[PDB]
Write a protein that binds this ligand. Structure first.
Ligand SMILES: [Mg+2]
Ligand SMILES: [Mg+2]
Lengths: 220, 222, 101, 67, 97, 390, 51, 59
RNA sequence: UAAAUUAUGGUCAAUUGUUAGUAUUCAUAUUAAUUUUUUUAAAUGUUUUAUCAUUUUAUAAAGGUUUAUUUUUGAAAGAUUUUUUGUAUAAAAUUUUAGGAAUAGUUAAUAAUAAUUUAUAAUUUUGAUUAGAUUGUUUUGUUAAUGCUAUUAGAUGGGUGUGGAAAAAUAAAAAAAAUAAUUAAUAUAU
């Protein structure tokens, strides 16, 4: 029940330095940007008091709101933030878009991942995690052939491949039976020396049983 | 066993006193030739004409300047070709007087006596663009200043020591350095006032105000 | 100043000092006339006030709201017998009038 | 500490201009800077570890508990 | 010199005061020797862009390598063999002749 | 504390006073317990530890040695505090138990950092990755193990720290019984160090802890021990050790170069040890703290040729295969590379047979100090030189 | 004259007693004895109605 | 504004004596020297006083 | 006496008036006049007491002349404690003379309060003593000025050994042992 930083040598010089008339503005900015806050319901309420008190909020305030919505999987809250950032023309960073992409991917909202991916596809340099939420959205609807096109879209954009990208793309080659697609994926993991996940190991053992491609090429 | 006390800079530097009965005789040339006799060509390697430092820790921290120095054990001493010029009161006074009398005669090099506060003032004048270069700068006795000229006349117009009589020295406060930076109601980066700090670093009047220090004032030049 | 005065050295130029007086007169004594940095704190009270020990005020938009200076006729002395002025000691005495104006 | 006794005997504190009247005059005004518009997310990030570098302790100093 | 560096109080004019020194000499070197300060990625890239794509590129510097690099723990006991050898060398004679 | 009549101890009285019988003594547990007792002290516990009735030079050397022990123990205290902070930070960010952090993997680190980055916490992922990166180099329980053992052996060597580890009032954790413990874990740990580590004085002097006499006598005892296990038939008369196989295995202790180097003298070449191994000749020199004397301490090429010619005259070895090489050692300590070069050049031992003969050589992690650059330049120009053939 | 004159931010962001430097005020040993005896006499005053 | 030491000394004089200093102390007075003795017959053996001698230790 | 190393593969300047502070008029400023103003004529009531007495009431001026200064343990403050006990008597330091030479109730030691002794004593040409001028004092004035020029806080070995302290022959307050009066302005002439 106290502001965590009170004053007298903790606030920057250009703001005057502990103007006590704005002591509530200094305490409100630390609650908005608290990295240890995990209550998403308070984060939406803390935006409404910074809107009322006239507190200027940059992209770091909205990224802290979108971060807290991913463990409770608040897909409705992540879209109302991006509606407001588009309403005020505050462009979200790639970490903030990746939070709303992950909040909608874990809620099985595949139609809403694809429309928020297409909003920031050409303009923003999206991440492999931002491509991963589109992979998990395609695989949730049985689009395992279409989920491999996201991996080709990630390769065309110059975004490198991470071990969580190989984990879900090798699972997409199971239902699609795309053994020629997983031939390029398995050769790329050995050249890049990535650790193979337990879900990626069983995906390679199933396709090497059906197509017999690892035994005739001597790659294990 | 009682040992004799070494008294003076000549006995503490270990002077041979080869000339009979004279203690104030110059020794650098004979000692340089004996040190050149000391070195030998080792065959299964000799030294170069670049300057040398007696310790490996005495190398300059700049990697480009370290290419111009090498490590000689006892051959790093007695370096140089020019000797101490004669015919005043202070080495700063003589350093200002020789440059002032040689810039009027339109000469290329001025042989000035090398002290600690002289070569630092020369380095500050070379940084500000008043001096084109130097010759034999590692010599601890005297070095040559290569002057700068542009379209007939000299770059250095007025060069005056702080001890104008040659005797009375002055200690500048940082208030004096801020006065010298803002003199006659303008901002003065034109006239260069040089001082020596308590850390024996030769610093102009701009960098003295930059870190809020003063020093003993040496000379002005513009 | 000697007895009952905090001045330790002359303002601008001094005879040559040695030892701790040389380091004190040029670097380490107090100086409130420095417009960039206040006189320093001891260790370790200078590291945490690094961002505050620069400049005077960060504004540089100071709209002057006081009375305007008088250019003709210029009054040399401003001496008033006052009744409720508690700064009347500081408001008298010869002061140097040098500013932006 | 300021105090003002009213003519009816009431002891009240001083107003802001009444408190500033006892100092030297400050005759400027800032018509631009508004402190709720300060940036706080990118570069201006005051950390609690920077305030923990002073190492304020109650066992090593008991002035706070005494007050 | 430029004339505005002689009369005006702007701070990069302090760059005009000193002599010309090399940019590889003033900046700290790398693992191979002297290096330009614009050739290291962490200097030329601003800090607000070092969050999304930067670690996505540089994931391979930390989490890629051989099986002995990725599957071997490095926080184990590194002096158990010396301890066992000194214990068995103290135990086995058990006498001073 | 220091009493009237306390004396500093050598290795013999440390061996005799702390001679107790123990069975299966835990090195790491007693080490952590004694260091936990050390870290719970204040600075005022380090004040009155110098014995009073001693001359001023001996008191100054004892004060320097105790200050070195205090600063190395403070450095290990802040390192252990950083270690516990990093382990607690990893166990708090991940959610894994604390005791299984040290047995974790890099694939597990990649999975946990990818899980933290998937939830949108790049700051916590960077903190976890940096804590694990600075935990892989420092997080072993035996990290500075030989240095900590030599610190506790030095605390026993002072003689005034033995009563500072007992007579404490503690509480039982489960029953809350206030009692006074008389158990001294420092005495048990020093007894186990003396019993198991028979060459703890050699490691103590080689790490630079001995400020009184240096490491030269420990170097001579180390070379005599390594000669007795390679020649296996050794006679030792005073300062001369000889093998009687007919093949030349001779160690000659010439002089101590600290007192032999007269400051202000012109005499080129003063060595400490002379080792003749077969046809090879090694002039083992410990460098001085004077940088103006290191250039005078190494002998000339003509002097080395004269020494090799004297070896040809005395030993009757023909001058066709006679090689003489200088060897320079650091002044106040002996790093790992110097001992490796001493085993390679002088005794002709590789790494595996030196680890078989010497068990504590693998965990010896002393390196050259960075602030002595002229010694490293001189040792690079000396140790990379070819054998001088007569 | 000086109608608008501001001071540094360091003056109003500083803590208490952080400007005092450590000064070694030496004195005579007779003054040491006198001040120690005076402080020991002032400490040992009996608690009456005046103390 | 930063007041000098003379402001503090004036404050001390005001708190001591009630006022700082009475004005009109200079007065530009013509101090004339009137000699009485003969030319080289001053009644002293070393220092012969023939002008207005200033009085003051440190001023 | 190293001998002109060849994608010239990136040019597009500067100025948006925001300042790290002794700044110089050989003729102008300070002094008296063209102008000063306003008064003042002494001869005087401090008070309580136990009554021809006792208790409280410690820096007026001229003169003479000083290199320097401060703090009573004692009286009061002041207390349900008490010995006239609560460290006051000291040091460094800086004056001037248009015609520059000697000085002394003298220096140190001391079983010596209150010096019958000892000594090759002490000050001074790095300026003494005497004679002259003489309170001192970053408080004044002037200037671009570490320059020149001014000063009025004070003290007082034979008046009385009283008093804690001589400062005692005269001061619009410093209200002086019962709330004399304490609203305000003249507060003095009256
Ligand atoms: Mg009394
Ligand atoms: Mg006598």
């Amino acid at each position: 029940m106290h502001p965590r930083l009170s004053g007298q040598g903790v606030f920057p010089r250009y703001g005057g330095g502990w103007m006590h008339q704005f002591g509530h503005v200094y305490a409100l900015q630390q609650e908005l940007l608290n990295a240890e806050a995990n209550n998403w319901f308070r984060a939406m309420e803390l935006w409404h008091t910074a809107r009322h008190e006239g507190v200027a909020m940059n992209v770091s305030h909205y990224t802290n709101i979108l971060r807290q919505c991913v463990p409770p999987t608040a897909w409705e809250a992540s879209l109302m933030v991006l509606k407001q950032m588009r309403r005020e023309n505050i462009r979200p960073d790639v970490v903030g878009v990746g939070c709303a992409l992950a909040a909608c991917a874990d809620a099985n909202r595949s139609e809403e991942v694809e429309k928020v991916f297409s909003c920031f596809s050409g303009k923003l340099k999206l991440d492999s995690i931002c491509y991963l939420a589109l992979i998990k959205a395609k695989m949730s609807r049985g689009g395992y052939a279409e989920a491999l096109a996201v991996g080709r879209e990630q390769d065309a954009d110059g975004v490198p491949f991470l071990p969580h990208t190989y984990t879900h793309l090798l699972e997409a080659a199971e239902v699609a039976d795309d053994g020629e697609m997983a031939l390029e994926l398995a050769r790329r993991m050995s050249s890049e020396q990535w650790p193979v996940s337990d879900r990626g190991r069983e995906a390679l053992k199933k396709l090497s049983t059906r197509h017999h491609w690892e035994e005739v090429a001597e790659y294990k | 066993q009682g040992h004799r006390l070494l008294h003076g800079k000549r006995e503490r530097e270990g002077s041979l006193f080869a000339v009979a009965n004279d203690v104030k005789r110059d020794e650098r040339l004979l000692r340089q030739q004996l040190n050149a006799l000391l070195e030998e060509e080792r065959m299964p390697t000799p030294l170069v004409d670049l300057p040398g430092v007696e310790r490996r820790r005495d190398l300059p921290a700049d990697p480009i300047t370290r290419l111009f120095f090498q490590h000689k054990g006892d051959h790093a001493l007695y370096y140089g070709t020019y000797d101490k010029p004669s015919v005043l009161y202070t080495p700063i006074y003589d350093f200002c007087h020789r440059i002032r009398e040689a810039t009027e005669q339109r000469k290329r090099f001025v042989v000035v006596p090398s002290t600690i506060e002289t070569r630092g003032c020369a380095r500050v004048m070379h940084d500000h663009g008043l001096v084109a270069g130097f010759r034999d700068f590692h010599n601890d006795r005297a070095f040559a200043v290569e002057l700068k000229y542009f379209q007939g006349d000299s770059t250095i117009n007025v060069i005056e020591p702080c001890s104008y009589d040659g005797r009375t020295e002055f200690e500048w406060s940082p208030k004096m350095m801020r006065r010298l930076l803002n003199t006659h109601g303008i901002h003065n980066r034109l006239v260069v006032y040089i001082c020596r700090t308590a850390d024996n670093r030769i610093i102009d009047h701009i960098h003295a105000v930059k870190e809020n220090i003063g020093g003993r004032g040496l000379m002005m030049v513009h | 100043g000697g007895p009952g005065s905090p001045v330790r050295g002359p303002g601008y130029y001094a005879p040559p000092m040695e030892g701790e007086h040389q380091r004190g007169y040029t670097a380490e004594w107090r100086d409130l006339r420095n417009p960039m940095r206040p006189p320093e704190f001891p260790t370790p009270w200078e590291r945490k006030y690094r961002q505050y020990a620069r400049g005077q005020h960060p504004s540089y938009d100071m709209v002057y709201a006081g009375p305007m200076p008088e250019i003709f006729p210029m009054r040399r002395d401003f001496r008033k017998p006052t009744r409720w002025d508690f700064h009347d000691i500081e408001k008298q005495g010869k002061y140097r009038t040098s500013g932006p104006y | 500490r300021f105090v003002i006794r009213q003519p009816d005997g009431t002891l009240r504190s001083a107003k802001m201009s009444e408190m500033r009247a006892w100092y030297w005059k400050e005759e400027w005004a800032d018509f631009r800077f508004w402190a709720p518009q300060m940036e706080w997310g990118i570069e201006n990030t005051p950390s609690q570890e920077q305030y923990q570098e002073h190492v304020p302790d109650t066992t090593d100093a008991d002035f706070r508990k005494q007050r | 010199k430029v004339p505005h560096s002689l009369i005006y109080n702007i701070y990069p004019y302090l760059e005009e005061i000193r002599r010309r020194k090399g940019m590889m000499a003033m900046h700290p070197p790398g693992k191979d020797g002297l290096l330009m300060p614009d050739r290291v990625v962490d200097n030329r890239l601003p800090d607000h862009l070092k969050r999304g794509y930067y670690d996505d590129v540089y994931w391979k510097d930390f989490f890629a390598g051989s099986d002995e690099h990725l599957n071997e723990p490095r926080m184990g006991l590194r002096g158990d063999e010396m301890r066992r050898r000194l214990e068995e060398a103290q135990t086995s004679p058990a006498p001073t002749t | 504390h220091a009493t009237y009549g306390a004396v500093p101890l050598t290795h013999s009285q440390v061996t005799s006073v702390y001679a107790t019988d123990g069975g299966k003594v835990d090195e790491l547990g007693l080490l952590e317990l004694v260091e936990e007792r050390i870290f719970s002290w204040k600075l005022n516990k380090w004040e009155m530890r110098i014995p009073p009735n001693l001359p001023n030079d001996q008191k100054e050397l004892i004060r320097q040695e105790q200050e070195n022990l205090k600063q190395i123990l403070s450095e290990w205290r802040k390192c252990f505090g950083a270690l516990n902070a990093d382990i607690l930070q990893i166990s708090s960010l991940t959610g894994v138990p604390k005791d299984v952090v040290r047995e974790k993997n890099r694939t597990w680190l990649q999975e946990e950092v990818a899980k933290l980055r998937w939830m949108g916490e790049v700051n916590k992922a960077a903190l976890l990755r940096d804590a694990f990166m600075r935990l892989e180099a420092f997080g072993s329980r035996d990290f500075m193990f030989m240095e900590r053992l030599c610190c506790i052996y030095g605390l026993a060597r002072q003689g005034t720290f033995d009563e500072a580890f007992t007579n404490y009032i503690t509480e039982d954790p489960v029953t809350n019984d206030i009692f006074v413990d008389e158990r001294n874990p420092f005495k048990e740990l020093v007894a186990h160090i003396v019993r198991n580590y028979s060459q703890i004085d050699i490691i103590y002097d080689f790490l630079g802890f001995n400020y009184s006499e240096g490491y030269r006598s420990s170097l001579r005892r180390y070379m005599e021990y390594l000669q007795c296990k390679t020649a296996e038939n050794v006679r030792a008369s005073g300062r001369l050790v000889t093998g009687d196989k007919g093949e030349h295995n001779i160690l000659f202790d010439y002089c101590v170069s600290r007192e032999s180097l007269v400051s202000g003298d012109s005499c080129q070449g003063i060595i400490d040890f002379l080792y003749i191994n077969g046809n090879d000749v090694t002039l083992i020199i410990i460098a001085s703290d004077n940088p103006w004397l290191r250039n005078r301490q190494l002998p000339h090429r003509r002097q080395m040729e004269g020494i090799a010619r004297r070896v040809c005259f005395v030993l009757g070895i023909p001058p066709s295969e006679v090689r003489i090489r200088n060897l320079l050692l650091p002044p106040t300590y002996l790093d790992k590379g110097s001992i490796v070069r001493l085993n390679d050049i002088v005794f002709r031992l590789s790494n595996e047979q030196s680890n078989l003969l010497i068990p504590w050589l693998t965990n010896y992690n002393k390196e050259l100090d960075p602030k002595d650059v002229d010694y490293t330049a001189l040792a690079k120009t000396t140790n990379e030189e070819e054998w001088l053939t007569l | 004259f000086r109608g608008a004159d501001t001071y540094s931010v360091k003056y109003c962001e500083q803590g208490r007693y952080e400007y005092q430097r450590y000064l070694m005020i030496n004195r005579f040993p007779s003054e040491y004895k006198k001040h120690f005896l005076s402080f020991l006499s002032n400490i040992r005053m009996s608690s009456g109605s005046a103390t | 504004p930063w007041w000098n030491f003379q402001t503090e000394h004036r404050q001390r004089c005001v708190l001591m004596y009630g006022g700082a200093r009475t004005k009109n102390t200079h007065n530009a007075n013509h101090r004339v020297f009137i000699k009485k003795y003969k030319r080289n017959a001053f009644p002293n053996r070393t220092r012969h006083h023939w002008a207005v001698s200033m009085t003051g230790v440190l001023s």
